[PDB]
Amino acid sequence: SVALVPHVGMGLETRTETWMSSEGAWKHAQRIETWILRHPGFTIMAAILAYTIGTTHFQRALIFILLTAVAP
Amino acid sequence: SVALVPHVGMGLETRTETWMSSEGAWKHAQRIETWILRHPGFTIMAAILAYTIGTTHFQRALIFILLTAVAP
Amino acid sequence: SALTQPASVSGSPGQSITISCTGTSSDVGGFNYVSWFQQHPGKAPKLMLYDVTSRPSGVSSRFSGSKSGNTASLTISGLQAEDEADYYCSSHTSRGTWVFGGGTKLTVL
Amino acid sequence: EVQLVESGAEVKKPGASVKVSCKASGYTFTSYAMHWVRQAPGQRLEWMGWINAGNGNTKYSQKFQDRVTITRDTSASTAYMELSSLRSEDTAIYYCARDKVDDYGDYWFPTLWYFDYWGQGTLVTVS
Amino acid sequence: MRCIGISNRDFVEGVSGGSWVDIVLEHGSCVTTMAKNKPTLDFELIETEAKQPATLRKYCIEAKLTNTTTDSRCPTQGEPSLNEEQDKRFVCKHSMVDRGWGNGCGLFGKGGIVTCAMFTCKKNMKGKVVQPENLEYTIVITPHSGEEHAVGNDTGKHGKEIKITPQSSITEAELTGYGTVTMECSPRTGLDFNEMVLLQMENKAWLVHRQWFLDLPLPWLPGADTQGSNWIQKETLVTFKNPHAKKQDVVVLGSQEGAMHTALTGATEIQMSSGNLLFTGHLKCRLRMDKLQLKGMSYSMCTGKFKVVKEIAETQHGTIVIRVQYEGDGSPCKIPFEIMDLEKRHVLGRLITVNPIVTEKDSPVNIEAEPPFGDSYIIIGVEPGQLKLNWFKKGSSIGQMIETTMRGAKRMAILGDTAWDFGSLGGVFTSIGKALHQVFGAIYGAAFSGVSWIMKILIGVIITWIGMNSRSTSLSVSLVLVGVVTLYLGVMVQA
Amino acid sequence: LQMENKAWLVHRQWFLDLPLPWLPGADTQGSNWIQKETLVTFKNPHAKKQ
Amino acid sequence: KQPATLRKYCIEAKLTNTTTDSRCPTQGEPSLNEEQDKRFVCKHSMVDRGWGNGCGLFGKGGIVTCAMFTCKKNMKGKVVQPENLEYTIVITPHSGEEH
Ligand SMILES: *[C@@H]1O[C@H](CO)[C@@H](O)[C@H](O)[C@H]1NC(C)=O
Ligand SMILES: *[C@@H]1O[C@H](CO)[C@@H](O)[C@H](O)[C@H]1NC(C)=O
């Protein structure tokens, strides 16, 4: 809804603090972390499909963390 | 916040129309296109990084669409 | 929680008199907010000493204060007949409230 | 050069709502704070008034938290002191006080030389 | 004096060329200027005010639906028609029910249905735009007089405050005792208006930019609009429920107040209650100091026997501050203050309250100075009865070079090319530096926009990995200006 | 799940993981909301007062 | 049929009785008796202190802030057991019968 597009990369950041610096800097990582701890099997399947594509280790890890970060 | 983790892929599906289908069925596909056409340089530079990281065209298009998807 | 300055002090005109206030660690012993006043009985009291030792404009450079830990003082050198007033104290706390002293009556004769 | 004057009150009844004002002159009123301290006759100076500003906030005293309300008006350049639920020991002299607000409008730290210029004080009685 | 104790203060010295210096100053920090004369001043930007705002667009937050009407018609015969579809307060949607003989129309098909309900708002959220004119900064100027109990006080009228507008001019500041300082301020290019919008909830207000404010999923309404009933994007605050193929219904969609307080992360709050008082951003100030007196020049030296009345205590940035009081005669005089090393030869470490002064009585005066990075004597008198004071200053040898480097890099991360305007006419260095920095900030600005805390770090690591495995000396340019720089901007973002 | 008049049908582990302040099924002068930090925010501008 | 509530969330709240408390930079951490009360919300941070703040020692003193968290809109999430869950099925034949 309107609670998306959270006004993050817009320039305009000064020395003053914003509305939710230190309470919005880590909500994305906490949300993904509790999502993985509630939904493991998509991360297992993301590891399997990330491994079979990507003929080097770097894009296997890259496609793994991107496929993890796309799903909420 | 609470308006994320939107209770989507959790089983419980029936023939009845849910709380938001045809309103929430396409909200990500609209806000991604709005975000692209108001922030193009990350999509060009993401196409550059996706063309760089990736040997075959399938993982180049895959890394392109995932890197486009992870940005808000 | 208040301040514990004594009831009444007196002395000969010319010597030094000391008026001390014992406070806690949240009003006197931690911060440098302690101000002094004098109150004539038919007059609103005026500010007589700033933060610990600093002085208002006007008054004649003889009202020296000190803070020796949890105790804040007001040393007056050169007593005169115009110094008969109710000497009250004040302090600002860490909570945000202002406290005050009990009250000393200074007479010269 | 800075003058604070009050409004004289004659007599009240216990249980009423006493009211006393403060006309301010010699400064711009929206940049200095206003306090209200009281003194029972021959007794201790008891702090009642709360930290005002251009917006007009409060900082609740511990003893008088849920019985007194203060108001103000910038257009008349005054501040209003209204004590309700009057008991027998509430009769005292009522003082004003000047303090300089922080330049960002929001006022938490007091001035080092707080309580500079005071009003003359108007006495109230209950019986 | 108003500068001390406030963190992230900073020093500038060097008024070379003519008699000017460029300083840039935010609302959080305050700047101390120095010279070989021209006594040390303290500049602080305290207000930013927008005088006359014009509204841009009014959004709805909490609505309600009354007069729910619906209408349906038998299948294969057109659409339903309803009188409330004409007026545009009513929100509408066409859908398909299934009908038959039990539905009393015959022909056993899939009929059409409409539904209508008027959209009444009861909570607004209006954004406002201001011109780059008719706005009024307030900068306060405090000289280091070392006056009694005037140090680090955000209260106190010890310094002058002047108000600067873009319709204004060279703006002299007649501050007493010291002469007159003039400022060629540049307030138009300060914080880049004609992009900012000044939206407003019930009692809060923020500062967002235009292209974010316009495309919101709330039902909006234009600024020049009385009788605010013709809401334009009404279908994003209702939901049409057609659960089975039976008749459908409308619902309101709650309050997005707390939903949009989630949306306003990263957007600096301003204070729109009485006046549009901003407290963020900066502005660039050219500072001309040809007409500063010193206030203590043409005074004799001192007789002796000073007395410290407040124990010294170093601040951050390693600058001590002492309050001394003069005992003696000949009261307008200088103070023989100097910091010397051990065994009394060299006078190392300078003053910040340069030319201190005893004024008008035995009133105590404040002296600020910068000791060297070890043990050093402090000498506050002439030889009958001096005041030798030991002091140990910790570290301060190589850590203030990396600390000064982190302050300069943090300034170049917060400020853009304006961070190069912190010095005085480099020529081949300063102008070239902000020229390359403004084309590189232009390229970096036309990328990374909308990219958060995390993804700058992620694609920064990607660019470092592309660098470390490349060849033909594109690796060094693929690290030193893009990789570690975007990692550093990845860490130092979202203030 | 129940709003003021509307009502839904959600499953448990989604209902238990919502960042929003909570209190158990017996209120009885509740006054003990658990994760209160999810619905207030504390502002510290300029490293001055908060 | 028999719903028993499990956990209720709050939607819209209200903060009153805001109190705060600071302390000198080297002298540890402030504390309030409102902090141990569970109906008050607190978080430690730090401000800048000096002689202008009436403190001394010129550092970064800690600070607490309180607020009485008061709810006014609830979201009762009830739950039921698999028993006393009463369905209802209509049975009807194809009696050729009017309407
Ligand atoms: C909060 O302030 C209000 C003001 O009347 C009152 O309920 C009470 O004094 C305070 N409540 C507390 C401290 O719990
Ligand atoms: C909306 O409802 C009110 C009350 O039922 C009624 O008076 C009014 O006429 C209705 N509006 C329209 C456009 O019918």
- Report DSSP letters for E331-360, one per residue: -SEE---EEE-GGG--B-S-BSS-S-EE-S
Q: Which of E36, E25, E30, E285 is nearest to E181 (CA)?
A: E285
Helix (H, G, I), strand (E, B) or coil at D93: strand
- The CATH superfamily assigned to D3-124 is Immunoglobulins (2.60.40.10)
Interchain pair E6, G58: CB under 8 A: no
Q: Is D113 an interface residue toward G (CB < 8 Å)?
A: no
Q: How many CB atoms lie within 10 A of CB E181?
A: 24
Q: What are phi and psi of E483, to 5 degrees?
A: -75, -65
Are residues C50 and C35 in contact, defined by beta-carbon separation less than 8 angstroms? yes
Instruction: Give the integer Cα–Cα distance in Å for D97 and E367.
Output: 32
Give residue G40 CA to ligand 1 midpoint distance, Å. 12
Domain ranges of chain C: 8-107
Instruction: Give the integer Cα–Cα distance in Å for D42 and D34.
Output: 24
Q: Which of F30, F35, F37, F3 is nearest to F17 (CA)?
A: F35
Are residues B46 and B53 in contact, defined by beta-carbon separation less than 8 angstroms? no
In this complex, the chains that touch G, judged by 3 or more CB pairs closer than 8 A, are: C, D, E, F
Count of residues for chain B? 72
Alpha carbon of B5: minimum distance to chain F alpha carbons (Å): 8
Token couple for C1: 């929680």
Q: Which of F16, F7, F1 is nearest to G79 (CA)?
A: F1
- Report strand pairing: E10-13 vs E31-34: parallel
Give residue E143 CA to ligand 1 midpoint distance, Å. 45
Do E336 and E407 lie in a common domain? Answer: no
Are residues E293 and E178 in contact, defined by beta-carbon separation less than 8 angstroms? yes
Give residue E246 CA to ligand 2 midpoint distance, Å. 26
Token couple for G31: 């504390």
Helix (H, G, I), strand (E, B) or coil at E371: coil
Q: Which amino acid is at D77?
A: S
Are residues E132 and E188 in contact, defined by beta-carbon separation less than 8 angstroms? yes
Pocket test for ligand 1, best of G14, G15, G17 (most atoms within 8 A of CB): G17
Are residues A22 and F49 in contact, defined by beta-carbon separation less than 8 angstroms? no
Q: Is E469 an interface residue toward B (CB < 8 Å)?
A: no
User: E-chain residues within 8 Å CB-CB of F47?
Assistant: 7, 28
Instruction: Give the integer Cα–Cα distance in Å for C47 and D118.
Output: 9
Strand order in the sheet with C8-10: C8-10, C104-107, C86-87
Domain ranges of chain A: 1-72
Residue F46: which of A16, A19, A20 has the nearest Cβ?
Answer: A16
Q: Is G10 an interface residue toward F (CB < 8 Å)?
A: yes
Are residues E316 and E88 in contact, defined by beta-carbon separation less than 8 angstroms? no
User: F-chain residues within 8 Å CB-CB of G13?
Assistant: 21, 39-40
- Report DSSP letters for A3-68, one per residue: TSS-S-SSS---SS--SSTTTSSSHHHHHHHHHHHH--HHHHHHHHHHHHS-SSHHHHHHHHHHHH
The answer for F 7-46 residues in CB contact with B (under 8 A) is: 8-11, 14, 17-20, 38
Q: Which of G69, G51, G62 is nearest to G24 (CA)?
A: G62
Q: Which of E261, B33, B70, E62 is nearest to A6 (CA)?
A: E261
Is the CB of E67 within 6 Å of ligand 2?
yes
Q: What is the CA radius of gyration of chain E?
A: 33
Residue D112: which of E153, E274, E279 has the nearest Cβ?
Answer: E153
Are residues D29 and D89 in contact, defined by beta-carbon separation less than 8 angstroms? no
Interchain pair E414, A14: CB under 8 A: yes
Q: Where is chain E broken, named by the residue before each break, C–N > 2.5 Å?
A: none
Q: Which residues line ligand 1 (CB under 6 A)?
A: D 60, 65-66; G 16-17, 68
Per-residue burial over E239-256, b if 16 or more Cβ lie within 10 Å, else e, is: bbbbeeeeebebebebbb
Q: Which of E423, E488, E407, E422 is nearest to E7 (CA)?
A: E407
At what angle are helices B57-70 and A57-70 packed, to 10 degrees? 40
Per-residue burial over G50-59, b if 16 or more Cβ lie within 10 Å, else e, is: bbbbbbbbbb
Write the CATH number for E318.
2.60.40.350
Q: Which of E393, E409, E374, E395 is nearest to E315 (CA)?
A: E393
Q: Is G58 an interface residue toward E (CB < 8 Å)?
A: yes
Token couple for E455: 């993804």
Do E341 and E427 lie in a common domain? Answer: no
Instruction: Give the integer Cα–Cα distance in Å for E448 and E455.
Output: 9
Helix (H, G, I), strand (E, B) or coil at E264: coil
Give residue F41 CA to ligand 1 midpoint distance, Å. 21
> What Å resolution does this PDB entry report?
3.3
At what angle are helices E483-491 and E453-468 packed, to 10 degrees? 160
Are residues E314 and E320 in contact, defined by beta-carbon separation less than 8 angstroms? yes
User: Which residue has its alpha carbon closest to ligand 2 atom 2?
Assistant: E67
Token couple for C11: 């002395």
Nearest CA in chain B to E261: B1
Helix (H, G, I), strand (E, B) or coil at E487: helix
Give residue E67 CA to ligand 2 midpoint distance, Å. 6
Are residues D86 and D14 in contact, defined by beta-carbon separation less than 8 angstroms? yes
User: Which ligand 1 atom lies nearest to the CA of residue G16?
Assistant: 1
Run of H or E including E404: helix E399-414
Token couple for D47: 């702090």
Q: Is F3 an interface residue toward B (CB < 8 Å)?
A: no
Q: Which domain holds residue E385?
A: 306-392
Half-sphere exposure of E267 (CA within 13 A, CB side): 26
User: Which residue has its alpha carbon closest to ligand 1 atom 8?
Assistant: D66
User: Which ligand 2 atom lies nearest to the CA of residue E89?
Assistant: 13
Interchain pair G24, C31: CB under 8 A: yes
Helix (H, G, I), strand (E, B) or coil at E68: strand
Give residue E445 CA to ligand 2 midpoint distance, Å. 52
Helix (H, G, I), strand (E, B) or coil at B42: helix
Instruction: Give the integer Cα–Cα distance in Å for E337 and E381.
Output: 7
Q: Is D104 an interface residue toward E (CB < 8 Å)?
A: yes
Instruction: Give the integer Cα–Cα distance in Å for E331 and E309.
Output: 17
Nearest CA in chain F to D107: F49
Instruction: Give the integer Cα–Cα distance in Å for E46 and E44.
Output: 6
User: C-chain residues within 8 Å CB-CB of D120?
Assistant: 44
Token couple for E238: 């209702």
The answer for G 69-88 residues in CB contact with C (under 8 A) is: none
Token couple for D15: 């249980």
Alpha carbon of D75: minimum distance to chain C alpha carbons (Å): 27
User: Which residue has its alpha carbon closest to ligand 2 atom 9?
Assistant: E67
Instruction: Give the integer Cα–Cα distance in Å for E186 and E164.
Output: 9
Instruction: Give the integer Cα–Cα distance in Å for G79 and E443.
Output: 56
Interchain pair D35, C45: CB under 8 A: no
Half-sphere exposure of B41 (CA within 13 A, CB side): 11
Give residue E68 CA to ligand 2 midpoint distance, Å. 10
The Cα angle at residue E182 between residues E178 and E188, in degrees rounded to 5: 145
Structure letter (DSSP) for residue B65: H
Interchain pair E279, D104: CB under 8 A: yes
Distances (CA, A) of D110 to C44, D98, D114, E153: 22, 11, 7, 10
Chain-centroid distance of CA E330 in Å reads 48
Instruction: Give the integer Cα–Cα distance in Å for D10 and D16.
Output: 13
Half-sphere exposure of E479 (CA within 13 A, CB side): 10
User: F-chain residues within 8 Å CB-CB of A38?
Assistant: 13, 17
| Beta partners for residue C74, in sequence order | C19, C65
Residue linked to tokens 């002395």: C11
Give residue E118 CA to ligand 2 midpoint distance, Å. 9
Instruction: Give the integer Cα–Cα distance in Å for E341 and B20.
Output: 77
In this complex, the chains that touch B, judged by 3 or more CB pairs closer than 8 A, are: A, E, F
Residue linked to tokens 């694609």: E459
CATH topology of domain C8-107: Immunoglobulin-like (2.60.40)
Are residues F49 and D108 in contact, defined by beta-carbon separation less than 8 angstroms? yes
Helix (H, G, I), strand (E, B) or coil at C35: strand
The contacts of residue C90 (CB under 8 Å, 6+ apart) are: C34, C35, C36, C37, C98, C99, C100, C101, D45, D114, D115
Run of H or E including E173: strand E173-175
Residue G51: which of E5, E7, E255 has the nearest Cβ?
Answer: E5
What's the distance, Cα to Cα, between the start and end of chain D in Å?
38
Alpha carbon of F9: minimum distance to chain G alpha carbons (Å): 10
Token couple for F7: 């009502």
Interchain pair E495, A1: CB under 8 A: no
User: D-chain residues within 8 Å CB-CB of C98?
Assistant: 35, 37, 47, 114
Domain ranges of chain D: 3-124
Q: How many CB atoms lie within 10 A of CB E388?
A: 11
Q: Which of B2, D49, A53 is nearest to E262 (CA)?
A: B2
Run of H or E including G6: strand G4-10
- Give a three-class secondary structure readout of F1-50: CECCCCECCCCHHHHCCCCCCEEECCCCCCCCCCCHHHHCCCCCHHHCCC
Counting beta carbons within 10 angstroms of the beta carbon of residue C29, is it exposed (0 to 12), middle (13 to 18) or buried (19 or more)?
A: middle
Chain-centroid distance of CA E21 in Å reads 22
Q: Which amino acid is at E261?
A: H
Instruction: Give the integer Cα–Cα distance in Å for C41 and C37.
Output: 13
Token couple for D33: 């704070």
User: Which ligand 2 atom lies nearest to the CA of residue E87?
Assistant: 13
Strand order in the sheet with D93-94: D45-47, D37-39, D93-94, D122-123
User: Which residue has its alpha carbon closest to ligand 1 atom 12?
Assistant: G17
Token couple for E183: 């400022």
Q: How many CB atoms lie within 10 A of CB E237?
A: 25
- Report strand pairing: E388-392 vs E375-379: antiparallel
